[PDB]
Amino acid sequence: DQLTEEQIAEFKEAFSLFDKDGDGTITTKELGTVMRSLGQNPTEAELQDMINEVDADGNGTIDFPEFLTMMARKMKDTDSEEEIREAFRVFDKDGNGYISAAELRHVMTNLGEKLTDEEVDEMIREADIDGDGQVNYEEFVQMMTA
């Protein structure tokens, strides 16, 4: 790999604070044990949603090369992905996984500095790559990282 050896040697003990059984992977139960021993009480849906953000293969569990991609973001100072992922959730009040034209036209007009309702029609027409009428999460990050 591009990573050195002693860094892998020190990420192994970071992985074995979660993987207590030594099975080679992390489930929601081993995560919830650490989350409760740190003093906070998640729900099952919250734990499963924390798993589903970094599960690349889609097996429902996290192994060590998936753990490295998670620790590549939480090691630096400003995790620029989460601060856009939750600014997407500040807009999506209905929780449908979409930003409609009405949600965007409600937020960007009255709050900010006097932005027109004509510019929102150009912005929504530029944002919808698939032509789905409204703004997804996938196009929302591709607009940020352009």
């Binding site: 620029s80 600014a87 500040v90 937020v107 352009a146």
Partner: protein, 360 residues
Amino acid sequence: LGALRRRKRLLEQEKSLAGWALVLAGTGIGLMVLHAEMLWFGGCSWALYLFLVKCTISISTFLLLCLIVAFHAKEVQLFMTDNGLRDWRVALTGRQAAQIVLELVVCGLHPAPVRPGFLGQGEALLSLAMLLRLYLVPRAVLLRSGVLLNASYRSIGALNQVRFRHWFVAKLYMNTHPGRLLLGLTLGLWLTTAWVLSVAERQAVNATGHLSDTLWLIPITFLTIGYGDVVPGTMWGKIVCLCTGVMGVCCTALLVAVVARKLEFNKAEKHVHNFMMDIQYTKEMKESAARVLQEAWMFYKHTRRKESHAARRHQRKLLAAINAFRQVRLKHRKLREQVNSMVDISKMHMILYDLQQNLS
């Protein structure tokens, strides 16, 4: 129930005999301070009035020495009622008789007339033994308050075994009025101790030790400033200026809790404060999430238009807006943690209320 009407009769009679003893002791101290001052300002021209005030002190300590015996002759008579005794020789213990003899000796000390402005060596300690006639205060304070006789107080105290005494009524008056007590106590100590020190150090020739110096020396010692403009000179001055310093450290460690209680929130006001800061932080998050798109769309606009310096001007503002958004959100989550930490107790009763729906 003949042993319950007689108990209230004797307890009212002891309230009267504990009021009049305190009046006749305050009169003795008030005629002692007058003698000690008109011996100083007067000299030997007023010897008639000095003898008259000394004899009046002797009369108004004889009647106090009679009323203390009249109070214990009601307390033994009450203790014989409460236990069904008839022979009084059974009731009068040894330690109580020793208490009576000590209590009569302490209220017996006064500057009695045996037959140029300083006091003597003996009639300055007998005169400052009059101030030990202030054990009569907590007795009269207890018996004048109704808590020793009021039936509802006694029944609720008997269900809970609290045993009404002096340290209970002291905490009552200290926790219902911490202001009047702590102010009129220090303004009754900074004048009594200022008079006692201005007995302990009087200088005839220069007039360098009277109340004009001690009313400045004692608050300065009490607050632990200690300038050093005036300093006590005798040995009895140096004892009193250490007692004042010890009482000052103790009353500072007393005031440090009373001021600690008052500035904190009421329990109902902190919830209003948190519930308003929550909807302020939601408004700031919804401002900042619009700032992020306001910069990112202009960045995409000038990215397509290839205005390069405008792109390098707006990408910096994009990074600054993300930096502001993270800080606002981390204020918001700390405040939501303060909310989730405080309403845990009501959450317990709420989960028990949701468990109350499990009977049918």
